[PDB]
Design a binder for this molecule. Structure first.
Ligand SMILES: O=P(O)(O)OC[C@H]1O[C@](O)(CO)[C@@H](O)[C@H]1O
Ligand SMILES: O=P(O)(O)OC[C@H]1O[C@](O)(CO)[C@@H](O)[C@H]1O
Ligand SMILES: [Mg+2]
Ligand SMILES: [Mg+2]
Lengths: 298, 298
């Protein structure tokens, strides 16, 4: 079988290294510039590959900076079959970083408007490629004007093939994903409250309730860690940006390698924490795996 | 005669429009992206052209994004004869702006290392082009590793042709410019103190003193306005980013059109203020010209 990632609104991450903090009306000189691939799906493909797990990235890229995007993907050993929109450029997400600090300021471009033709090409692309034994991971939110309506066809077209379907989205797209019934989603506390529009029950109850529709539910609680529901059980995951994408990637890898869920959660969490410490190193992420603690909630 | 601008470290300004202020560890979504030419020299060429004054821009651009730089220049009606460094890209200066606010955060890339060959090509380029009746305006500081030594040849090579030479630089380059004896420079208060390394005399005296070497000395005092020395006289210019580049451009234009110095100062100052009000419009800058007041210091 195979794993497919779908990055509707890909990007090129441009790391801008400056000295100290980022003043907000001052001039901040860049010491050096660094590039990496952007888009949730892509980040997820990057993790899968480090795990020696086969996968292919799908999405819509711009023509004008394609060569640059491909060099990065080749470097991150990411197999892809992108659709290309002529006369446009993949957006960039400027990441103002710093060795002198541990912060990061994000300034992502909105991305371009996708042509109707490439929307349809993505649909058959999925029909022609995805099998029931495969897994699909639509990650990152849609580019401007890729409507909820468009998103609906996308999800249904995937479901129609019977493959595992995970979605890392937000806003009405996440809600929509839930209503459609995907196998995986990683909402934050508040997104959970939003999806249900319920504010009087405990979060726990919101999650157990939501687990009735999503079989691999993982709710991020920020620094506190996470809560994952699966097979009737609820787990509190306690750890010792892009951290969320790596978590997804790691989590998918675990399921792909078919390892215990509690175990998958320790690996996912070890890799996510491994980055919140990096400007990730898989080897380095492995030392954190067994520092992660799981607490089953009864 | 003709005017030449020299932008040793050109750039492409990428305006990033977000909502409200710029948080510094948050994600700031870009509403729309806009491009403009970067580099002091170029900005100066942009002003000259709006004044219908003939000029040509010189400098070293990268190959990978040349087409994009040329489209902008064509749009700003800027004539150029750039030298090109193969396999490299012109740096970008990210300008985080906002309609909801009147601020701007600058994040300029350092730029690339220029090849020895293009350093030399710039030198003969100047010898073959510049005549005594022309004006040269080296503006913006040098790219990484374009040494003080390199800068020395540049300036001397221009002087050797007998043309008017203005320099808008900083750090040791500005000092060097002063020692070399250029016709124009626009240092800020502190740069003046630095050039002389004198801290016990009034700024006025520092300027009159410095005027002995620079015949068109203009010292910027920030919000307070400016002080310009010329022909033995000292003027306090009182007004009603990129504002400095436009001032230079406007000032050069005045001298080019050979209009009174006090007058040149009112135009330069009107145009600079015209931008500190813009996200400049020449027509709009004209309404501010006669709101500028000149006070001769005796
Ligand atoms: O796919 P999106 O939802 O548009 O997000 C893209 C952004 O996500 C990040 O990976 C942060 O999670 C950034 O590096 C940037 O690439
Ligand atoms: O030529 P430099 O000294 O490297 O400065 C370039 C920068 O100058 C600015 O025009 C501000 O004066 C920015 O827009 C950016 O292009
Ligand atoms: Mg999210
Ligand atoms: Mg200056």
């Amino acid at each position: 079988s195979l794993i497919y990632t779908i990055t509707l609104n890909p990007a090129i991450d441009r790391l801008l290294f400056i000295r100290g903090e980022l003043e907000k009306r001052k001039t901040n000189r860049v010491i050096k510039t660094e590039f990496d691939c952007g888009g949730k799906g892509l980040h997820v493909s990057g993790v899968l590959s480090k795990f020696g797990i086969k996968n292919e990235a799908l999405g819509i890229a711009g023509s004008d900076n394609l060569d640059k995007l491909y060099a990065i993907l080749k470097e991150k050993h990411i197999n892809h079959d992108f659709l290309v929109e002529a006369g446009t450029s993949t957006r960039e997400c400027f990441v103002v970083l710093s060795d002198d600090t541990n912060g990061s300021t994000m300034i992502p471009e909105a991305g371009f408007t996708v042509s109707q033709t490439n929307k349809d090409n993505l649909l058959k692309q999925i029909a022609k490629k995805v099998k029931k034994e495969d897994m699909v991971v639509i990650a990152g939110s849609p580019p401007p004007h890729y409507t909820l309506s468009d998103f609906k066809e996308l999800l249904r077209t995937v479901k129609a093939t019977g493959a595992f379907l995970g979605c890392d989205n937000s806003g009405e797209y996440l809600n929509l994903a839930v209503e459609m019934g995907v196998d995986f989603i990683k909402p934050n506390e508040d997104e959970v409250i939003a999806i249900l529009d319920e504010k009087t029950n405990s979060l726990e109850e919101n999650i157990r309730t939501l687990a009735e529709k999503i079989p691999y539910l993982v709710v991020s609680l920020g620094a506190k860690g996470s809560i994952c529901a699966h097979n009737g059980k609820l787990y509190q995951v306690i750890p010792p940006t892009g951290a969320g994408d790596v978590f997804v990637g790691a989590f998918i890898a675990g399921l792909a390698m078919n390892m215990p869920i509690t175990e998958t959660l320790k690996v996912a969490t070890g890799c996510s924490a491994s980055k919140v410490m990096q400007q990730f190193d898989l080897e380095a992420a492995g030392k954190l795996k067994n520092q992660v603690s799981i607490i089953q909630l009864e």
